[PDB]
Subunit: 119 residues, 2 copies
């Protein structure tokens, strides 16, 4: 969607599964930086404070593609299994369908790949 105001975004995420997420451009870049936004359940019986991510410039994207960021988003803790709070894109589309086709790929060194993680 790229361009949308951080007002009519919230008011378009009072949709669905605590786990829908926009694609936005950031307005506060000078390098032009893409981002996403997603939504939870807060227990108060309503909308979340919602959630967005520090926007991904070329720097990061040089080193790993946008899709692949998403696939493997975490969020973490000290000693808790890590979440993946990304299920459905805009209306209802399973992550691993929209961006399926863009994923890269799927005595002996051990295989690493990069990963963006919060907290």
């Amino acid at each position: 969607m790229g361009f949308i105001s951080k007002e009519r975004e919230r008011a378009l995420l009072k949709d669905q599964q605590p786990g829908t997420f926009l694609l936005r451009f950031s307005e506060s870049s000078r390098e032009g930086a893409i981002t996403f936004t997603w939504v939870e359940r807060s227990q108060n019986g309503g909308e979340p404070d919602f959630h967005a991510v520090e926007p991904y410039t070329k720097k990061e994207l040089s080193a790993v593609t946008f899709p692949d960021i998403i696939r493997n988003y975490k969020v973490m803790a000290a000693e808790n299994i890590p979440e993946n709070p990304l299920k459905y894109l805009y209306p209802n589309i399973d992550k691993d369908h929209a961006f399926g086709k863009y994923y890269s790929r799927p005595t002996g060194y051990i295989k690493t790949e990069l990963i963006s993680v919060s907290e």
Copy 2:
């Protein structure tokens, strides 16, 4: 340690805590690419198959610094807390000492990092 043969490496890692690691430069790139090597306990009452990682070249290091790879190395699973097999550098030196001093740093956007991860 840079330069060493993958013979007198193993035979100098029958030192210590299942959790020591050198630094090595890789012999098998042309691009020049550093790597690390570390050791476990296999339960058989001896040395591990040991472990070393796919070599980290410029590309990767462009994006996030080598030290910072170290700090936050993972290894993961489906639904298991993620480990940190790097504790002691060569003879006995706590990770968070050797490479302390190079670490970078320690409605409202949420802070992301990059991180290197296996499995």
